[PDB]
Design a protein around this ligand. Structure first.
Ligand SMILES: Cc1cc2nc3c(=O)[nH]c(=O)nc-3n(C[C@H](O)[C@H](O)[C@H](O)COP(=O)(O)OP(=O)(O)OC[C@H]3O[C@@H](n4cnc5c(N)ncnc54)[C@H](O)[C@@H]3O)c2cc1C
Ligand SMILES: Cc1cc2nc3c(=O)[nH]c(=O)nc-3n(C[C@H](O)[C@H](O)[C@H](O)COP(=O)(O)OP(=O)(O)OC[C@H]3O[C@@H](n4cnc5c(N)ncnc54)[C@H](O)[C@@H]3O)c2cc1C
Ligand SMILES: Cc1cc2nc3c(=O)[nH]c(=O)nc-3n(C[C@H](O)[C@H](O)[C@H](O)COP(=O)(O)OP(=O)(O)OC[C@H]3O[C@@H](n4cnc5c(N)ncnc54)[C@H](O)[C@@H]3O)c2cc1C
Ligand SMILES: Cc1cc2nc3c(=O)[nH]c(=O)nc-3n(C[C@H](O)[C@H](O)[C@H](O)COP(=O)(O)OP(=O)(O)OC[C@H]3O[C@@H](n4cnc5c(N)ncnc54)[C@H](O)[C@@H]3O)c2cc1C
Ligand SMILES: CCCCCCCCCCCC(=O)O
Ligand SMILES: CCCCCCCCCCCC(=O)O
Ligand SMILES: CCCCCCCCCCCC(=O)O
Ligand SMILES: CCCCCCCCCCCC(=O)O
Lengths: 395, 395, 395, 396
């Protein structure tokens, strides 16, 4: 009944890929409509402002695009992993990297609902599903980003409170965030920092919580990445997320999802770029016929489509495993690493096929190129992905 | 209940991969035992001889390894495509490329049962399933392989018999074949040679049918490959396979299975090489530790394992599609091309990891390296695969 | 005597490479000071402005960095090719791509003093060497860049004047230019586009000459690139550069220098990126020790340094050949193609070695990454380079 | 007044590349003639025997191909480094990896003349220059090839004699060698073998010296590679090459020439494959034209030609530096590593361009493919090459 991407008219067609159902296709169509009409037309302006509007967040919240795979009885929408993936994919197909929906719904809401108390869940989830409370997660610091145990941010108890001090960097949704999950060292006496880390829900408005100026980056112009500062912030007992000192444990449990998320975003962006480029060369007149008639272009496009389809098959297998809660760390790392790498190889060749116009911001491929470059870096660099993958091979 | 290759203890473990059932596992174990006892111990001798014995072929037929996925009511063993794939895979896992079982079972027996008459099927299939009648297919000629329009071998109608003249090169199982499917032009006056070709079943013993000497090759030392010559062979009317002048149609229908076969053999060979090399470096002492303790080696193995697992996912997806009769030519070409390229990339890096010993015929990786080099060439060059894949992209 | 880049303390050290003299080093040192003191400190401002100041051009001219290798008695600065290259290289080593000096001096001024008259050489060369007259070169058009036959810009002659019409795209120095060498079709009923093309000097001010607004690109933020328009510009008889319909001949003779120029800039930017990155990883610590101590990082740096040094050797060989006026089109195409691809390969790996900081505009590697991507596109795409290189191989 | 490979009619043409002179071109034509007439016609037979004839060695000696760049007053032919390189290159252009000439002349004879005694030089060099005494060098052992400290072969002083025990593997010219420079531990009491290693001249015939049978390899079919065993061989004081415990110092001084040698052989092999393949596709008919008319084939050839030419330029700069005795270990490592890697990349693409025929031993490209695979491994693996190169990048 369903075709796989290689046989589809377009890698981005609706109604394809075996892991989806007819009900998923319907939802897919609506999400695609949302990005096409509510995101794509305002993106150029958000790029200029360096951030998206609160309006689109509330719009996404109203249409039900936030907290999709978060249990309904907890304040989420209640869909399965496949529905949540559709939202990641469609955003990638729109080539609009500004809105930080997936970090919000795929990571932050996930930590809160999986390890938060009943009161934290009741206080945050509905607001986040509505898109009125924007979430962010802050682990990385100026001195440590792959070496989590090297974290310096710290929190020390003062009765029932916690005095939080330190700073984070490269925080997505940094500017617009209303709630930020902060990783901090709570036990300087623990044997290893891995046994002395906790998670704290820091809210915009607490005294001492300062948001730095938006960072100037080579890409992701509309994503408000920023530095965060904590100045002797007195945090109520309710700010502590999960058990004290069990923070590393919670991060480890959530990592697999974060990696698969990045992986699907990466391969979806590649499918976008391929179709975008396919279209360009078949339209670009040259030597009387289209650039698409040149043999070298045809072989190049074949190479790109093959690698893209091969990788999508693996990512879809991972989405299936994760749905069944059977996707382990190593497999998640393979997907993240291989897909993020492919995304940059595809972007590079696709810009080339566009000639000079590929270097112009007017053309989508231009921003696809700079937006792609960040994927092999965040969420655990690919060097780290290979390290983790090698553990089961040699040890 | 079933792990995929990334999570298994070894990429070659039995009981892994969701496309197989526990009944397939029982069968795989038995086939693996067969190669371990009836092929591996005698392969060195066969390399020297330049061909395997008739004995192993008959043992294979008796044990039920030939004609798997060939209709039982047609004289085959029956069983699904997955069972047939298990035999391709296990031969790859044994690193013995001598026995030409794959071409015989997956191609020649296929052409006969799908497009042959009751008489032809009754005459060939049972003895082919028994391993007493070895099959080969001959399309390639000295003048051209990638140029189908350049076939010179021809058959002239003389009364009710066919007069066949010409020659073919690079024919696998060419030396010990008992029946060979020959592609020849039967209508030179046809608009397109694609509509003027026919298939003929030539048997060993006919007058005018001459087998040339075994060709000296860089690898596949035990695979008897040779040139064939047809000198005014008077073929009975029962030598024609299928309808006259529709040979191109039949070839086009079998190609997808041929490409998929090559793809699975390639990815399976890669999995063998990976585990073989993984084992070697964990055992090779160096600098007070094992080569496997070196970070560069760990990352190299991670890269290899990741790419192999990713391709395995696409190939398994292709097997599933083919089992459903839903695998088209373009997808088959993607698997053939991508897997055969990976196979050589893997072999190169695995030889490197063995150091000097990787150049010694004594070590399996050495013959794996030279054996791997033929895959990107036969069954349609990877260059031809790209042209075919590009066809749907631009037209 | 002198050391080559592999043996030097740093690839960018002054006093290395056999093709330079002690006198060249002194010039080198003074050129290095200029960029550090007059370019680097203000580049960020120009990036935001979208163009450099006319002041920096006058400072460059006054200091004798504009028009090197241009005959002194022609109003130039004199000096061999090695001196002109030093200015290209040092601008690369400063990682400041804003000022279009090399085009102005290495391209525009070369055309004027090689195929221009004394009335033109006397008029333009003096003020161009002073940085008061900024030149450009318009060849590429919206319809085609690579397909030379696709030129729509035509110059119908009227009496002794010429009626210029058409448009250009991607014109570097498009905003600051005071004189632009325009390529237009003069002889339409010409057999080949070699007997129908002419070079014109369109000075700023002539009616009908319309400069479009600066183009928004992914990189070269400080390089004013614009679209140029021509709506019936009456051109004097002196506006014609060289012989009518002889443009092709002029361009073909200058192309080598342009290719060598891009190649040296590409390889120099690679040497800069390497030393920048080598320094970064030696000062960055993680998981206990400096990133530079990781074996993977070490081998990566060894690969980068090796490829960079091998390519530098080729480029210097090309500078020598060009000095003796013996660099052909093919050899120059090899240099431009290989060095431009290597530059992006180096940039990618160097961004990865900086981790997240490599994505921040604050770090030089970030702008170096996006600035490098233009090289394989302009000055003739690398695809065109291969075509040209292939011509003598098969034809 | 000379063209660089990029501009020549063929990358293998005589009279090109700035480092050579018209005198060199004359010698070049002569050497090329030697391989076409005395080697090419018999290589197939040698591949089956797994070793070349002692006759081709003596013929090479008589025509002055052995000992080039080995001082004439020392028993060699003399000539500069460029002349010795011509012999390495021409053998590669012939696509005959059988004759172990380069090793014998560019390595073994070099050790002897650069660190041997006047007596050792008198006895060995003359007959080696004549091709009467074939040389081999043995460092690698069963359990250690990239690990120096792993060497187990050892020699103990017994009076003025040396007792040698151990074994080596992968020894080129192993079967027909008359003299072998053996690396052995002479002082394990030292902090590192870098100060406890000595070189010895082991000769065929000495009691206890055993040659193993020829090893079966994927390529280099006519190159007699073998393992060697030393069983309490009583070596006279004269067997010691150089000073006791200074072996490492000598090996260290010779490595750059060894790496440069492999480097030149690697890039030269690539030049041969390119022209061989270029010829094939221009001659191969397809679609009523030649495979060379396909745009993909043209671009692929341009890519190969460019990389080969870029690498040749670097290798020639290294030849010029070594001529002046100014070639660094790190620089020589860059050449050995980069050229051997490119050689295999070129081999792979060229086999592909030949279609099925590239898999047939009949065609030159097939043996060139398996012959190339050895280069990234011996003379120090490419991984070791990177390690050495990284030293000055990260430390100091
Ligand atoms: C735009 C953007 C958005 C991001 N969003 C978030 C976010 O929302 N929240 C958050 O907390 N962080 C986020 N990050 C930070 C990101 O996760 C880190 O940059 C990333 O984890 C890399 O850490 P680092 O920058 O400290 O690099 P480092 O850890 O310093 O690593 C630098 C280099 O050393 C290499 N290296 C280090 N260790 C090894 C090793 N063991 N083996 C081999 N190589 C190694 C790294 O791979 C890299 O090549 C984001 C970053 C960017 C750029
Ligand atoms: C920032 C920037 C600055 C520039 N500055 C100048 C300048 O100052 N003056 C000037 O005149 N130009 C300049 N250019 C323009 C530049 O020279 C052209 O963009 C370049 O020549 C490519 O032409 P195109 O963009 O039309 O690509 P196209 O010709 O459309 O090519 C598009 C794709 O088709 C491929 N293709 C086309 N022909 C072949 C072929 N025959 N074989 C295989 N593939 C082929 C191309 O390689 C590319 O992959 C600049 C460009 C940029 C981006
Ligand atoms: C045909 C042939 C001819 C030869 N001729 C000679 C000869 O005449 N005389 C002689 O003495 N030797 C010769 N050799 C031997 C050759 O020098 C060695 O095989 C080579 O140095 C590799 O050593 P090894 O085989 O012990 O591999 P090992 O040292 O075991 O290395 C195995 C793998 O580990 C890798 N590795 C080891 N160390 C590191 C590291 N530090 N970092 C990252 N990776 C590492 C190696 O690169 C390789 O990938 C020859 C070899 C062959 C194949
Ligand atoms: C060991 C071995 C076993 C084999 N077994 C069989 C068998 O049993 N029966 C049988 O019939 N055949 C068999 N073959 C033959 C094999 O199918 C052919 O060699 C293969 O199809 C390639 O054809 P060719 O060798 O004629 O190469 P050619 O067609 O000459 O191609 C030569 C080069 O040109 C390239 N080229 C051709 N067309 C294009 C294009 N249009 N665009 C770009 N590049 C192109 C090719 O890819 C290749 O790079 C086998 C081959 C080998 C080596
Ligand atoms: C380019 C838009 C990508 C949106 C999904 C990003 C998912 C990973 C976010 C960063 C996670 C981390 O680094 O902790
Ligand atoms: C390495 C052993 C592979 C055995 C299966 C080979 C299948 C393809 C055989 C050649 C088919 C053809 O080219 O017509
Ligand atoms: C990154 C700065 C490069 C400065 C030198 C550019 C030389 C080529 C300019 C474009 C030439 C052309 O496309 O006609
Ligand atoms: C293909 C023929 C190559 C001839 C030169 C080989 C040079 C390296 C020989 C082995 C050196 C060593 O491993 O000690």
């Amino acid at each position: 009944e369903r075709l796989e991407t290689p046989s589809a008219k377009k890698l981005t067609d609706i109604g394809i890929r075996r892991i989806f159902s007819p009900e998923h296709d319907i939802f897919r169509k609506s999400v695609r409509k949302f990005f096409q009409e509510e995101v794509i037309p305002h993106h150029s302006e958000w790029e200029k402002a360096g951030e998206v509007s609160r309006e689109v967040w509330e719009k996404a919240g109203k249409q039900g695009l936030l907290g999709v795979n978060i249990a309904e009885h907890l304040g989420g929408i209640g869909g399965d992993l496949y529905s949540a993936a559709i939202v990641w994919e469609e955003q990638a197909y729109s080539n609009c990297s500004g809105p930080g929906f997936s970090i919000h719904s795929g990571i932050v809401m996930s930590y809160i609902t999986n390890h938060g108390s009943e009161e934290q869940i009741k206080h945050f989830i509905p607001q986040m599903t509505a898109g009125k409370c924007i979430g962010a997660i802050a682990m990385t610091e100026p001195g440590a980003g792959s070496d989590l145990q090297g974290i310096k941010t710290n929190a020390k108890k003062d009765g029932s409170d916690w005095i939080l001090n330190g700073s984070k960097v490269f925080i997505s949704n940094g500017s617009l965030s209303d709630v930020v999950i902060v990783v901090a060292v709570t036990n300087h006496e623990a044997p290893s920092p891995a046994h002395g880390i906790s998670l704290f829900l820091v809210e915009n408005g607490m005294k001492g919580f300062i948001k730095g100026r938006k960072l100037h980056k080579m890409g992701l112009k509309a994503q408000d990445t920023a530095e965060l500062f904590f100045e002797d912030i007195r945090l109520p007992a309710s700010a502590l997320l999960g058990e004290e000192n069990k923070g590393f444990y919670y991060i480890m449990k959530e990592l697999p999802q974060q990696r698969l998320l990045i992986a699907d975003v990466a391969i979806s962006a590649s499918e976008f770029m391929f179709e975008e480029t396919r279209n360009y060369v078949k339209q670009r007149k040259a030597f009387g016929k289209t650039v698409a008639h040149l043999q070298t272009v045809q072989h190049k496009l074949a190479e790109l489509k093959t690698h893209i389809c091969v990788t999508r098959a693996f990512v879809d297998n991972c989405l299936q495993l994760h749905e069944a809660k059977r996707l382990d760390s190593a497999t998640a790392c393979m997907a993240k690493y291989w897909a993020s790498e492919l995304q940059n190889s595809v972007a590079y060749d696709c810009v080339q096929l566009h000639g000079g116009w590929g270097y112009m911001w007017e053309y989508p491929i231009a921003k696809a190129y700079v937006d792609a470059r960040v994927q092999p870096i965040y969420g655990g660099t690919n060097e780290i992905m290979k390290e983790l993958i090698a553990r089961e091979i040699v040890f």
